[PDB]
Design goal:
Shape of chain A: flat
Protein name (chain B): Spectrin beta chain
Helix content of chain B: over 70%
Strand content of chain A: 35-45%
CATH architecture of chain B: Up-down Bundle
Helix content of chain A: under 10%
Order of helices and strands of chain B: HHHHHHHH
Subcellular location (chain B): Cytoplasm, Cytoskeleton
Oligomer: heterodimer
CATH topology of the largest domain in chain A: Chondroitinase Ac, Chain A, domain 3
Largest interface: A-B, 24 and 30 residues
Structural class of chain B: mainly alpha
Structural class of chain A: mainly beta
Largest sheet of chain B: none
Number of domains of chain B: 1
Distance between the termini of chain B: 140 Å
CATH architecture of the largest domain in chain A: Sandwich
Number of strands of chain A: 33
Radius of gyration of chain A: 26 Å
Family (chain B): Belongs to the spectrin family.
Shape of chain B: rod-shaped
Number of helices of chain A: 5
Organism (chain B): Mus musculus
CATH topology of chain B: Methane Monooxygenase Hydroxylase, Chain G, domain 1
Largest sheet of chain A: 7 strands, antiparallel
Subcellular location (chain A): Cytoplasm, Cytoskeleton; Membrane; Cytoplasm, Myofibril, Sarcomere, M line; Apical cell membrane
Chain lengths: 453, 301
């Protein structure tokens, strides 16, 4: 519409780490990282205040095994900020949610040393109201899961926020009366609390992590078949009565039960308790009772004696948190025959490194976001018209951690000068000799022309 | 015989060459900046000495030329060995010169980066201050003085930033071993400076927003004060006629002031909510009440 600018209407702008807001309301996107946005509604801020929302790149929030941050820690201020109405903060993340297998949780620390879960109490009507008079549009939930954007709604501000990737958890309060707590991801997984198993009322939680035959079969083949991992979150707690767990059998004695009673950040240790605990098979599921809250797992391994080791071989891998990251390849030509090649795996890292631009390096390849697994190594090889120097010695590799730098220096020589210097670069989880298994990502390339200096 | 004396001269020259090599291979690079400077001077003197020795090796060249023929198979190989060995020592001179320079530059560049980082920090603390003023006159002073700080720091910091960035751009162009670290160092400064430029913007915005609110809470106190002047009308003749005319002109003045104040007050409602809004329409209610009573009394006249 051709209407004079109100000068009393929300502010549309971008910020780097801090900005100015007044009860007028504003939408502040961030140039540094796409999808980072603050949406303060009109009339929901008492007075003009300087707001801050910087990624801290304080004390790390406690994280059990199988969990990792989805995004760098979010710092917002003023620390004690209070608003009449809820305000929206949107952060991009890199945790691979794997459909509904995994989920995100939000933590907040007022002082920076203690973290508590963040839950917001608001009305269903408020959600539509939250926009108020703003002309902004809110992405649908599916369109948010697709863009890997996490939306924190908050009616107050804390010193820090954290987005944490974890295995989906179903939680419901339970007290003396009794209770049932079933799984959404795996409906057959279930836990029953009898009358009088707890004294106080607690919010019990249940995780179920299902198995992917590609990884299990790859590490063990037909040696064993597992069921999902069922976890009762208030671990290391004796129950005054016995809980009744149900777990579907592993699709194929021959069936062992494994449990890990470790708590906190302690790495888990698996033991077999099949002899001690009775197992009941109904409707292709197993039901047992247990007085303790622990991890649980079923195995259909033929070699019962080694069953625990098999679990360790699988667990060690599948606990690794999955991150969706980008692969970027840079190169400079020493001469036509040879060249230097720097490779990176990045999450939140700089889109275009200054060093490469300064050294006259060129972006030659750049993969779409792909699942790489936290803390596991990466193997790199080139298979096309050029090859990378190697000998009867160890190869070169880099390890992926989230939000750290992940660099691999390389030297590559054109194999033959008959045709153009294009190539194929593959990043794998295991070295290539047998049948090659899916790599981590594939990038084709083309060496840039020689620069004379 | 003659060959023996020539061997003696070659031995002395070879000894000198080794002595220089051994002194030039020393691994000590330095501690403070001056230590690496003094070592770069020292090694420059060694390099000049090596260049000066060219005449001394020339004497051997002449002696070998005038000796080369009793048994020159050994003589030619030995002298040629001195030729390539001396060339090698010269190249090693260029090497150690370069590494002492690059060590020195790492030392100074680190000093400047740390100093600039502490300098931005000092400015940042003064830019992210939360003081906004107790009275309108004082907030006005802070607004002007801070604006001066914004310009002075705004241009002052740019020269320092450009100096550090160019110093990095160059040391990367050279091929410094630590170039990778240096790159992040520059990225650290470039972002931090940018944030300060943004911070000082928000702070300046905050001061402006404060000034208008104080302006309202100036007139509310000041204009309400002129309300008491109206009481003079109740007790109060050519002289009286002149005073009355002046008084009516004063009322005409007043009308513009109250209209401008109310219009100014309107903006605060848009920019404030809750406790603050309520307190604004509050004082904007008190002054308007004075307007109503004063206008009623003037109407009675």
């Amino acid at each position: 519409l051709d209407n004079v600018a109100l000068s009393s209407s929300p502010i549309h702008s971008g910020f780097l780490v801090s900005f100015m807001v007044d009860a007028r309301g504003g939408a502040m996107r961030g140039c540094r990282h796409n999808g980072l946005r603050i949406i303060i509604p009109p009339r929901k801020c008492t007075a003009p205040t300087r707001v801050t929302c910087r990624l801290v790149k304080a004390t790390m929030p406690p994280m059990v095994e199988g969990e990792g941050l989805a995004s760098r820690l979010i710092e917002v201020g003023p620390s004690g900020a209070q608003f009449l109405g809820p305000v929206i903060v949107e952060i991009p993340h890199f945790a691979a949610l794997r459909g509904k297998e995994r989920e995100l949780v939000v933590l907040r620390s007022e002082n920076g040393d203690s973290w508590k879960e963040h839950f917001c109490d608001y009305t269903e009507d408020e959600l539509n109201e939250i926009l108020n008079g703003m002309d902004e549009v809110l992405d649908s939930p599916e369109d948010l899961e697709k863009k890997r954007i996490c939306r924190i709604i908050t009616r107050d501000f804390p010193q820090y926020f954290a987005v944490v990737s974890r295995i989906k958890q179903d939680s419901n309060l339970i007290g003396p009366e009794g209770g049932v707590l079933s799984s959404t991801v795996v409906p057959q997984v279930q836990a029953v609390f009898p009358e009088g198993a707890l004294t106080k009322r607690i919010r019990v939680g249940l995780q179920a992590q299902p198995m992917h035959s590609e990884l299990v079969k790859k590490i063990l083949g037909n040696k064993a078949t597992f069921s999902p991992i069922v976890t009762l979150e208030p671990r290391r707690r004796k129950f005054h009565k016995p809980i009744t767990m149900t777990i579907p059998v592993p699709k194929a004695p021959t069936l062992r039960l494994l449990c890990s009673i470790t708590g906190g950040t302690t790495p888990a240790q698996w033991e077999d308790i099949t002899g001690t605990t009775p197992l009941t098979f109904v409707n292709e599921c197993v039901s047992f009772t247990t007085n303790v809250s622990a991890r649980f797992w079923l195995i259909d391994c033929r070699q019962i004696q080694e069953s625990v080791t098999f679990a360790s071989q699988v667990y060690r891998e599948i606990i690794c948190v999955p991150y969706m990251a980008k692969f970027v390849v840079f190169a400079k030509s020493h001469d036509p025959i040879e060249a230097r090649l720097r490779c990176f795996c990045m999450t939140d890292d700089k889109v275009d490194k200054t060093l490469e631009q300064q050294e006259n390096f060129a972006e030659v390849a750049r993969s779409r976001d792909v699942e790489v697994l936290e803390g596991k190594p990466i193997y790199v090889d080139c298979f096309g018209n050029l090859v990378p120097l190697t000998k009867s010695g160890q190869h070169h590799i880099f390890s992926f951690f989230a939000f750290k730098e992940n660099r691999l220096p390389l030297f590559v020589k054109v194999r033959d000068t008959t045709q153009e210097p294009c190539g194929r670069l593959s990043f794998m989880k295991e070295p290539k000799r047998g049948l090659v298994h899916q790599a981590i990502c594939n990038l084709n390339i083309t060496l840039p022309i020689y620069t004379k200096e | 015989f003659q060959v023996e004396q020539y061997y003696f001269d070659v031995a002395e020259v070879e000894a000198w060459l080794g002595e220089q090599e051994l002194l030039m291979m020393s691994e000590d690079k330095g501690k403070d900046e001056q230590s690496t400077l003094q070592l770069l001077k020292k090694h420059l003197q060694l390099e000049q000495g090596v260049e000066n020795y060219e005449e001394s090796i020339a004497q051997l060249s002449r002696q070998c030329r005038a000796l080369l023929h009793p048994d020159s198979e050994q003589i030619s190989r030995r002298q040629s060995q001195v030729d390539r060995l001396y060339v090698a020592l010269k190249e090693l001179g260029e090497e150690r010169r370069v590494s002492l320079e690059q060590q020195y530059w790492l030392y100074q560049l680190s000093r400047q980066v740390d100093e600039l980082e502490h300098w931005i920090a000092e400015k940042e603390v003064v830019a992210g201050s939360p003081e906004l003023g107790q009275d309108f006159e004082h907030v006005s002073v802070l607004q002007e003085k801070f604006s001066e700080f914004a310009s002075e720091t705004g241009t002052a910091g740019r020269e320092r930033l450009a100096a550090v960035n160019q110093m990095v751009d160059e040391l990367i162009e050279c091929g410094h071993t630590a170039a990778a670290t240096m790159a992040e160092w520059k990225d650290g400064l470039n972002e931090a400076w940018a944030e300060l430029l943004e911070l000082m913007g928000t702070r300046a915005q905050l001061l402006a927003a404060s000034r208008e609110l104080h302006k309202f809470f100036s007139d509310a106190r000041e204009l309400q004060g002129q309300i008491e002047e109206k009481r003079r009308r109740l007790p109060r003749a050519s002289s009286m006629q002149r005073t009355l005319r002046a008084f009516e002109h004063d009322l005409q003045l007043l009308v513009s002031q109250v209209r401008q104040l109310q219009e100014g007050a309107a903006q605060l409602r848009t920019v404030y909510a809750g406790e603050h809004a309520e307190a604004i329409a509050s004082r904007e209610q008190e002054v308007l009440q004075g307007w109503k009573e004063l206008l009623a009394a003037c109407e009675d006249a």
